[PDB]
């Protein structure tokens, strides 16, 4: 079974290569134990090589297989990294084929769902400037994939947060707080919340980027999920130092937060209360 399949990934007969590729992709879309069988069979170097196939269908299906491998456990994500997939994945971020572009983004997002070391490998492969550019894609699906991927990177340690800030992501993220698309809006809030879960100077960069007026407004959102994400991100900002806290107060937050203490949702009441007590000493 799997050793023959892997051999055929190098076959000059394209029907063999594709037949082997479709069976491996099937297997890699199962559980982690199946993913491991594929990795242990030695499929990764050849799958990485197929990221240069001039055949677009083959390229895309190799990409989908890697993305599935990368939805596995952190050691499975690390094998993808150790097989040298990141440089090609980053190049693919400038593919004019939007289905290929999307699958590269999805795969990088999966890799960035790993541990902080896996996230750092994504940063070190130079993914950030392209991800930041993709935040102004006219394609909503592309934009959402880039956003998801950035949010994942921003969910790592403070050094990972710092690279996102350093790559210039903040102004784009704050602009997306005007998005009329509710999913985009939610994921931008969530990404800013993750940045604002860092150090006080990382909180200050969010403030400096102009996020507070939209955050405070969104405490009155009719979508409870949006309200909650705004309130979480704001509560993170309010956990900063005195200069951070003073800026929250001057943005008008005390009045909305008090209003929230009578909200029917207990998580909202409690979050608002925590926020207020931080802000008031």
Author numbering: 12 to 292
Copy out sentences from the published article reporting this entry, exactly as the authors wrote them.
The armadillo repeat serves as a scaffold for the development of modular peptide-recognition modules. In order to develop such a system, three crystal structures of designed armadillo-repeat proteins with third-generation N-caps (YIII-type), four or five internal repeats (M-type) and second-generation C-caps (AII-type) were determined at 1.8 Å (His-YIIIM4AII), 2.0 Å (His-YIIIM5AII) and 1.95 Å (YIIIM5AII) resolution and compared with those of variants with third-generation C-caps. All constructs are full consensus designs in which the internal repeats have exactly the same sequence, and hence identical conformations of the internal repeats are expected.
The structure of YIIIM5AII without His tag was determined in the absence of calcium ions and refined at 1.95 Å resolution. This structure is most similar to chains C/D of His-YIIIM5AII (r.m.s.d.s of 1.14 and 0.60 Å for Cα atoms of residues 14–288 of chains A/B and C/D, respectively). A superposition of YIIIM5AII on His-YIIIM5AII based on the N-cap and internal repeats M1–M3 (residues 14–168) reveals that this part is very similar in all chains. However, in this superposition the C-terminal repeats of YIIIM5AII match nicely with the C-terminal repeats of His-YIIIM5AII chains C/D, but they are shifted towards M3 in chains A/B (1.4 Å shift of Trp201 CA towards Leu158 CA). However, in YIIIM5AII the spread between Trp33 Cα-atom distances is extremely large, with the largest distance observed between repeats M3 and M4 (the distances between Trp159 CA and Trp201 CA are 9.42 Å in chain A and 9.43 Å in chain B). This distance is probably too large for binding the target peptide in the desired conformation and this mismatch is located almost at the centre of the putative peptide-binding site. Although YIIIM5AII is considered to be a full consensus design regarding the sequence of internal repeats, the internal repeats are not identical in terms of structure. In the more stable YIIIM5AII structure the side chains of Leu16, Leu20 and Val7 adopt a uniform distribution of side-chain rotamers in all repeats.
